[PDB]
């Protein structure tokens, strides 16, 4: 019926002023735009159809053409920044916001989806969607006593669009918009649907990706324990954003990091630091590195949870990016820790994998490892046990690599290596 029309026929139908002819042609355009292989978005745009679709959005008396034009515009807005811009330039934003309160659930869901695509383009369109007043009707769609009474696809789409309103930086979303959205986010973070949980954690991870005041806005809502619980989940699409949120949070103050620790997060890290998905291991090790940059009592809680052997393991064998994060974790540990904590780290076996990493072609990791070793040597000086450490370094091949690093391109590398062999 309306399958595989030409763009020319679609234009002919839309440019009649027979409402039914226009609806037929609009559905034909929707079907064209919802095909998987190269939908002709740019042909539709060049034919001048966007203003006609936008005007169809306002035809309250004919709900089907509202739906079909909303779907067509959704798919146009899902494309490149220029295609989304063409949708915005046609005045689509206020018309979609108007459709949010439509009595037909599929139409308001379509408007939710379209606003999600538009806001997901970036900071400017996100803030423009916000300025047109989308947040109030979006949140009103979720003001029900139990979220389980909403249709699952509807709820997932609302969660995804809210996460896009929470997304992107330079600038971050407006503070009052974040404050307005957060309670609904907290409630969605306790819903039972895995996709809703994943997208809620994504929103929270966006909101915690910034300065300590943003992190504090999130942390004050009390979501950290629920984030830890989701960190323990079996579904990788949930664990990934949960772990990103937790790592973002521990980039903040020592008190925010302490909130992460009190919630029980460290007990999950034996799994995370051996997780078979490389990115999980990398981000867990980065999170650990930001925890070992904290207070000595926090370093001590890392010790008590048995996590130093897991750091040794990741340093010994992992993807190289994960190994670099582990080297960072070790240098933070050795710079902030007491003498007994550094002794314990040596007794767990850090020295040999630390040395083995000194044969890497990465200048930053060489600097990091050299700083770590000098910190360890300083603690050994306090204990008068420095040459036992030097013999330990030489028996595993460390002295050879440190001495070779004297004839190295980077000036800081050569300086630190020469200092080490001159002193010890």
């Amino acid at each position: 019926g309306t399958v595989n029309w030409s763009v020319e026929d679609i234009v002919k139908g839309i440019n009649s002023n027979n409402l039914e002819s226009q609806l037929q042609a609009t559905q034909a355009a929707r079907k064209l735009l919802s095909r998987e292989k190269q939908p002709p978005i740019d042909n539709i745009i060049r034919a001048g159809l966007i203003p006609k679709f936008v005007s169809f959005l306002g035809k309250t008396d004919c709900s089907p053409i509202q739906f079909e034009s909303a779907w067509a515009l959704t798919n146009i807005a899902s494309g490149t920044s220029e295609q989304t811009k063409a949708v915005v330039d046609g005045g689509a934003i206020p018309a979609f916001i108007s459709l949010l309160a439509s009595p037909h659930a599929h139409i308001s869901e379509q408007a939710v989806w379209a606003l999600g695509n538009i806001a997901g383009d970036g900071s400017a369109f996100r803030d423009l969607v916000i300025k047109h007043g989308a947040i109030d009707p979006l949140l009103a769609l979720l003001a029900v006593p139990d979220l389980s009474t909403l249709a699952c696809g509807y709820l997932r789409n609302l969660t995804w669009t809210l996460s896009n309103l929470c997304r992107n930086k330079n600038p971050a979303p407006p503070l009052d918009a974040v404050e307005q959205i957060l309670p609904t986010l907290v409630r969605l973070l306790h819903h039972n649907d895995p996709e809703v949980l994943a997208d809620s954690c994504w929103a929270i991870s966006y909101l915690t990706d910034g300065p300590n005041e943003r992190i504090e806005m999130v942390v004050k809502k009390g979501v950290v324990p629920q984030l830890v619980k989701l960190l323990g989940a079996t579904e990788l699409p949930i664990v990934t954003p949960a772990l990103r949120a937790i790592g973002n949070i521990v980039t903040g103050t020592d008190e925010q990091t302490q909130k992460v620790i009190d919630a029980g997060a460290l007990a999950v890290f034996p799994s995370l630091l051996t997780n078979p998905k490389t990115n999980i291991q990398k981000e867990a090790t980065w999170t650990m590195s930001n925890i070992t940059a904290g207070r000595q009592d926090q370093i001590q809680q890392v010790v008590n949870h048995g996590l130093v052997p897991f750091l040794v393991g990741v340093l010994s064998k992992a993807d190289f990016k994960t190994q670099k994060e582990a080297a960072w974790a070790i240098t933070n540990y050795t710079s902030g820790g007491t003498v007994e904590q550094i002794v314990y780290l040596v007794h767990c076996g850090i020295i040999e994998p630390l040395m083995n990493l000194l044969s890497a072609k990465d200048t930053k990791i060489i600097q990091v490892i050299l700083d770590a070793i000098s910190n360890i040597f300083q603690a050994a000086e306090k204990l008068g046990e420095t040459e036992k450490l030097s013999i330990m370094i030489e028996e595993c091949g460390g002295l050879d690599k440190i001495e070779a690093l004297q004839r190295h391109e980077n000036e800081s590398v050569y300086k630190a290596s020469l200092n080490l062999i001159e002193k010890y």
């Binding site: 919802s34 095909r35 998987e36 939908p39 798919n75 899902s78 989304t84 999600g116 997901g120 896009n164």
Partner: peptide, 7 residues
């Protein structure tokens, strides 16, 4: 990721 086509 950021945008979603409705098929």
């Amino acid at each position: 990721r950021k945008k979603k086509n409705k098929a």
